[PDB]
Amino acid sequence: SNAEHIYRCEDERFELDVVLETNLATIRVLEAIQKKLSRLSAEEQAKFRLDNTLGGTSEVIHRKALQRIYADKAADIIDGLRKNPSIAVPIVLKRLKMKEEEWREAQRGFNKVWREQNEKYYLKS
Template sequence: KGKGAAPGKKKGAATTASIKTAPDPDIRVPQLERNLLGRIKAALAVRELWGEFVKCLDLFAQKLISRVELISLISDIFPPGRENLLEEFDRLLASRGATDNPTEEAWFSMPLSEIDFSNCTRCTPSYRKLPISYPKPPCSERTAMCRAVLNDTWVSVPTGSEDFAFKNMRKNQYEEALFKCEDDRYEIDMVIDSNQAAIRALEPLAREIATLGLSSGELTRYRYRLEKRTLNVIHLKAIARIYGDHGTEILE
């Protein structure tokens, strides 16, 4: 009986060993992909280029870029004369089902104002549900609460007399004057904001100059120089606008 138990024990140990050394089918890479990736890595040679290639693959795996965009990105990485590897990699992606959907490309290039919502579900007079075939852009940073409360399905659409493209709307002379007035007010608001920003930047400098003049106790004329980083482009443009033809002289 003791002799019969020993072979059974050895057989169990051998089975255990075979289980430990068996590769995980979920992480096993097919031989074709392994060979191709090995040749691509050897062709890239430089470690930084291989790192860029892996980053592009990661973007594609997260569905942040399409197959066409992936091929366009990695084509700049491959050295001259190795276009055959790029074509082979593209064929491999296509054979594994990584094909671009032309319908999705059409959706993303179409503004919402041109989508036909006449047959879509309506919850209120102004809100329509996006078509079922409309692709939802990936968003990897959303939490469970974001997915529960944020709206990715319903959009507001114009109704009645507003149900046409704004750029094609016909305007009479009074509406033209109204739009021009709004544009002028917007431009004036931008000028006021830039002037206020320039004043906020210049006031501390003026106080500092006045303090230096008082502390000297003399009427000596100082020549002050500002660092280039003290005033940005917005401040300089505001000063030049205020002084007109003498703006360049003031800035110097």
């Protein structure tokens, strides 16, 4: 046939599709908060703080995404978000944005090319 057997996409897409979706959701929320921050004062970081923000229901999304990049020190970063938003959020977001583009690069390789190959003419061989 080709090499030996037809190796169709396994779980690779699943990992990327989910992690990118999770990424984008966290990208949105952090950029939203960071924009609302616009560098706040100490008393303002006390006033406007992630009390119910990034939590409630969709916390697992950002929590998991953050634990994936900061596995060992996830608590420290989570605490930072729940404490000093105008400090942690800008930094963590910048880490997340560079990682976003890197994940996007991976998505380009797996998901994007998969899109191309699947929608185009695969032929009858």
